[PDB]
DNA sequence: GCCTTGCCGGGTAAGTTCCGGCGCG
DNA sequence: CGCGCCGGAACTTACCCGGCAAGGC
């Protein structure tokens, strides 16, 4: 459908880097604010909000796309009631998705919490849940893999592909053209 | 004598929620 | 009065990075 893989990528980002936050103000005033957060100024500029732009069309919200400055990182922010639970309703049916979006929320999951490097394949995160339920992703898609504690203090699991299947993963997955391409995939 | 991968500490790139505006029925 | 969009940024830590060493082959 092409909307639905954008939406899950996005998505693999919101949950990665950023979040859904319904926000209760002085009063009674609120806000829904979809968020991703990114420290580089052009990976939001030019890849997360163009993405987000296409969505925003496809489903006739008229938030605007905001990109605030802060001190650590840029935030792509929308603020959208019905943006939200488009995501929001996205999350808790998460185990429904089809192929086309599995391969589309792993690949932004790995881009905002993933080993960059390549060099090992790790996923980090504290939702040991979420990793339970990519990681049988990954076995249905054939990439052997595994969950530890990789974090004490903090309490974050690791999702390790085992290296064995690196090129299944990163030609299968990460650099599929069937919806967006992630930032080092396009180049490969 | 490699490679894979569980484990671990460093600290930065994330995340979360407050603020003060405005608009609209 | 009630509720939802803008625009900002302060406030903690959950990621990522990369070393080490144990275990396979
Ligand atoms: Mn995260
Ligand atoms: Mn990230």
Same mark, same amino acid.
Request: charged share 25%; proline share 2%; net charge positive.
């Given at each position: 459908?092409?909307?639905?893989?954008?939406?899950?990528?996005?998505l693999?980002?919101?949950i990665?880097?950023?979040?859904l936050?319904?926000?209760?103000?002085?009063?009674?005033?609120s806000?829904?604010?979809?968020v991703?957060?990114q420290k580089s100024?052009?990976?939001?500029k030019?890849?997360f909000?163009?993405?987000?732009?296409?969505?925003?069309?496809?489903?006739?919200?008229?938030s605007k796309?905001?990109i605030?400055?802060?001190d650590?990182?840029?935030?792509?922010?929308?603020?959208?009631?019905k943006?939200?639970?488009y995501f929001?309703?996205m999350?808790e049916?998460?185990?429904?998705?089809?192929?086309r979006?599995?391969?589309?929320?792993?690949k932004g999951?790995?881009?905002?919490?993933?080993?960059?490097?390549?060099?090992?394949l790790?996923?980090?995160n504290?939702? !040991?849940?979420?990793?339970? @339920?990519? $990681?049988?992703? /990954? +076995?249905?898609?054939?990439?052997?893999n595994?969950?530890?504690?990789?974090?004490?203090?903090?309490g974050?699991?690791?999702?390790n592909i085992?290296?064995r299947?690196?090129? !299944?993963?990163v030609?299968? @997955?990460? $650099?599929?053209? /069937? +919806?967006?391409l992630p930032?080092?995939?396009?180049?490969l």
């Amino acid at each position: 459908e092409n909307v639905s893989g954008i939406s899950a990528y996005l998505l693999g980002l919101i949950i990665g880097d950023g979040g859904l936050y319904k926000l209760k103000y002085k009063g009674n005033r609120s806000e829904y604010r979809v968020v991703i957060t990114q420290k580089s100024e052009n990976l939001i500029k030019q890849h997360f909000a163009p993405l987000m732009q296409f969505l925003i069309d496809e489903l006739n919200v008229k938030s605007k796309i905001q990109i605030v400055k802060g001190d650590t990182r840029y935030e792509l922010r929308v603020s959208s009631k019905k943006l939200y639970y488009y995501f929001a309703n996205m999350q808790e049916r998460i185990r429904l998705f089809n192929m086309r979006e599995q391969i589309a929320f792993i690949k932004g999951l790995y881009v905002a919490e993933g080993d960059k490097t390549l060099k090992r394949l790790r996923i980090w995160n504290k939702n !040991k849940a979420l990793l339970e @339920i990519v $990681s049988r992703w /990954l +076995n249905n898609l054939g990439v052997r893999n595994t969950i530890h504690l990789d974090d004490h203090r903090h309490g974050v699991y690791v999702l390790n592909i085992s290296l064995r299947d690196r090129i !299944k993963f990163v030609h299968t @997955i990460l $650099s599929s053209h /069937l +919806n967006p391409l992630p930032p080092e995939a396009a180049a490969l």
